[PDB]
Scaffold this active site. Structure first.
Site, mmCIF file in Angstrom:
data_model
loop_
_atom_site.group_PDB
_atom_site.id
_atom_site.type_symbol
_atom_site.label_atom_id
_atom_site.label_comp_id
_atom_site.label_asym_id
_atom_site.label_seq_id
_atom_site.Cartn_x
_atom_site.Cartn_y
_atom_site.Cartn_z
ATOM 1 N N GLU A 193 57.046 -4.109 66.487
ATOM 2 C CA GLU A 193 56.049 -5.137 67.467
ATOM 3 C C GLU A 193 55.277 -5.265 66.692
ATOM 4 O OE1 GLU A 193 53.119 -1.997 69.418
ATOM 5 O OE2 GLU A 193 51.514 -4.725 70.195
ATOM 6 N N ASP A 217 48.971 8.655 56.440
ATOM 7 C CA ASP A 217 48.503 7.106 55.526
ATOM 8 C C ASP A 217 47.907 6.157 56.334
ATOM 9 O OD1 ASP A 217 49.056 5.380 53.889
ATOM 10 O OD2 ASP A 217 50.684 5.135 54.413
ATOM 11 N N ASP A 266 53.238 2.044 60.143
ATOM 12 C CA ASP A 266 53.850 2.624 58.782
ATOM 13 C C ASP A 266 53.414 3.887 58.830
ATOM 14 O OD1 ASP A 266 54.080 2.570 56.271
ATOM 15 O OD2 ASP A 266 52.726 1.675 55.528
ATOM 16 N N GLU A 312 45.228 -1.237 55.700
ATOM 17 C CA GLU A 312 46.869 -2.086 55.337
ATOM 18 C C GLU A 312 47.188 -1.389 56.520
ATOM 19 O OE1 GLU A 312 46.920 -0.842 51.444
ATOM 20 O OE2 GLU A 312 48.805 -0.235 51.486
HETATM 21 N N1 LIG Z 1 54.940 -5.470 62.980
HETATM 22 C C1 LIG Z 1 53.049 -6.769 62.280
HETATM 23 N N2 LIG Z 1 53.216 -6.966 62.306
HETATM 24 C C2 LIG Z 1 52.609 -7.975 62.134
HETATM 25 N N3 LIG Z 1 52.228 -7.736 60.485
HETATM 26 C C3 LIG Z 1 52.597 -6.406 59.789
HETATM 27 C C4 LIG Z 1 54.443 -5.281 60.712
HETATM 28 N N4 LIG Z 1 54.108 -4.048 59.964
HETATM 29 C C5 LIG Z 1 53.618 -4.951 59.003
HETATM 30 N N5 LIG Z 1 52.882 -6.241 58.694
HETATM 31 C C6 LIG Z 1 52.335 -6.110 57.730
HETATM 32 O O1 LIG Z 1 53.110 -6.090 56.513
HETATM 33 C C7 LIG Z 1 52.004 -5.072 56.060
HETATM 34 C C8 LIG Z 1 54.006 -3.823 54.786
HETATM 35 O O2 LIG Z 1 54.013 -2.991 56.142
HETATM 36 P P1 LIG Z 1 54.061 -1.718 56.387
HETATM 37 O O3 LIG Z 1 52.554 -1.237 55.532
HETATM 38 O O4 LIG Z 1 54.798 -1.191 57.331
HETATM 39 O O5 LIG Z 1 54.797 -1.492 54.920
HETATM 40 P P2 LIG Z 1 54.786 -0.030 54.051
HETATM 41 O O6 LIG Z 1 53.212 0.070 53.500
HETATM 42 O O7 LIG Z 1 55.705 -0.568 53.007
HETATM 43 O O8 LIG Z 1 55.127 0.941 54.878
HETATM 44 P P3 LIG Z 1 55.354 2.773 54.227
HETATM 45 O O9 LIG Z 1 53.864 3.082 53.823
HETATM 46 O O10 LIG Z 1 56.371 3.685 55.575
HETATM 47 O O11 LIG Z 1 56.971 2.587 53.241
HETATM 48 C C9 LIG Z 1 51.069 -4.338 56.343
HETATM 49 O O12 LIG Z 1 49.976 -3.718 56.051
HETATM 50 C C10 LIG Z 1 51.187 -5.543 57.393
HETATM 51 O O13 LIG Z 1 50.275 -6.921 56.218
HETATM 52 MG MG LIG Z 2 51.433 -0.100 54.343
#
Ligand SMILES: Nc1ncnc2c1ncn2[C@@H]1O[C@H](COP(=O)(O)OP(=O)(O)OP(=O)(O)O)[C@@H](O)[C@H]1O
Ligand SMILES: [Mg+2]
Ligand SMILES: Cc1c(C(=O)O)cc(-c2ccc(Cl)c(C#N)c2)c2cc[nH]c12
Length: 262
Positions: A85, A130, A148, A134
């Site tokens: 989403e 977590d 996340d 962010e």
């Molecule tokens: N559905 C979304 N819509 C808009 N922005 C998003 C979305 N998902 C992530 N983002 C942006 O991308 C960033 C990184 O995504 P996410 O937090 O899913 O990655 P991650 O921190 O690498 O995950 P994980 O800790 O599970 O490995 C988010 O903090 C936000 O900045």
């Molecule tokens: Mg993240």
């Protein structure tokens, strides 16, 4: 069973440690969503494949206004893609950078939305673990959305996550290898609440070791502007011993919440 040819990719939405998230349009229905792209090589070098598996498995079986939907996923030679989403208004992290601090109305409203989502999670015995700014995203109505789920798990757990990444949002039980449960997210709600009013989380330090120390000895002070109502709630949530921490019920009924949410 979808593939990458089913999408038009637009601009980047964010970088996580693993996730490179892009805006996308499914070609068929023109639906707007977000693709989280992960590199097989880095998952495999970090050995976080299980985290991905939990993220996908847990996050897809959850439905709640305040929780980011995972719609599907697929993969190819080098990458894994999660279909998510889209959250139009960014992250709370960014909001916080733009404002420094949030007023009580905003703080208490975000705390409510969090408490709700958590509640729904916890009722399924699921814990996020977590809950940093962010990973809190805003939907079109400015409503908060949890995301996340790579560190999420069912309670109870012993399992380490970060070797040492950000400790800022983690309760002591966690930063010390102990069995921990649902109470973990209660501690984080406290850090968040405080961060939201102050602009700094309460245990920030120049080094990892000092933060670690602050965290385990629960060392924090409030600056002058923080109201008794808030002091009170933050103090109940930041308890060393997990079981002395409020239930989600109590947080929502907290006089400071009801005085200030929407
Ligand atoms: N559905 C979304 N819509 C808009 N922005 C998003 C979305 N998902 C992530 N983002 C942006 O991308 C960033 C990184 O995504 P996410 O937090 O899913 O990655 P991650 O921190 O690498 O995950 P994980 O800790 O599970 O490995 C988010 O903090 C936000 O900045
Ligand atoms: Mg993240
Ligand atoms: C080597 C490899 C393969 C494979 O070739 O079979 C698949 C994956 C993987 C993991 C999780 C998901 Cl959810 C998906 C999907 N869809 C695919 C991974 C992850 C790291 N290496 C992998």
């Amino acid at each position: 069973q979808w593939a990458l040819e089913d999408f038009e990719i637009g601009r980047p939405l964010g970088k996580g440690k693993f996730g490179n998230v892009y805006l996308a349009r499914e070609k068929q229905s023109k639906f707007i969503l977000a693709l989280k792209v992960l590199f097989k090589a880095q998952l495999e070098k970090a050995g976080v494949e299980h985290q991905l598996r939990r993220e996908v498995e847990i996050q897809s079986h959850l439905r709640h206004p305040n929780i980011l939907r995972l719609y599907g996923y697929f993969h190819d030679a080098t990458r894994v893609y999660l279909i998510l989403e889209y959250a139009p208004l960014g992250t709370v992290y960014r909001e916080l950078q733009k404002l420094s601090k949030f007023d009580e109305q905003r703080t208490a409203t975000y705390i409510t939305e969090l408490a709700n989502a958590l509640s729904y999670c916890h009722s399924k015995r699921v814990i996020h673990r977590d809950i940093k700014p962010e990973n809190l995203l805003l939907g079109s109505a400015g409503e908060l959305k949890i995301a996340d789920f790579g560190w999420s798990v069912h309670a109870p757990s012993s399992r380490r996550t970060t070797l040492c990444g950000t400790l800022d949002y983690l309760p002591p039980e966690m930063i010390e290898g102990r069995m921990h449960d649902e109470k973990v997210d209660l501690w984080s709600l406290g850090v968040l609440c405080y961060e939201f009013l102050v602009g700094k989380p309460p245990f920030e330090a120049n080094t990892y070791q000092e933060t670690y120390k602050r965290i385990s000895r629960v060392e924090f002070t409030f600056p002058d502007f923080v109201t008794e109502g808030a002091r009170d709630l933050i103090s109940r949530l930041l308890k060393h011993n997990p079981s002395q921490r409020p239930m989600l019920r109590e947080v929502l009924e907290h006089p400071w919440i009801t005085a200030n949410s929407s």
